[PDB]
Amino acid sequence: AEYVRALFDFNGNDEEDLPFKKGDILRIRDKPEEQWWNAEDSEGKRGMIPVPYVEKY
């Protein structure tokens, strides 16, 4: 459905955050806020990701 690609690595300081690496393709699951979305990675893990760190796929 909706995929984004990581532009930068991200680890996050909150436990709800989904860490990722530049180049990863993530699927967007929910947009509870304008700049922080819930996404799923290629291993099926879920978490919050910062919109500025990704681009549309």
Partner: peptide
């Protein structure tokens, strides 16, 4: 380095 991390609401 990455862009600014947006604040969480």
């Amino acid at each position: 380095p990455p862009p600014a991390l947006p604040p969480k609401k």
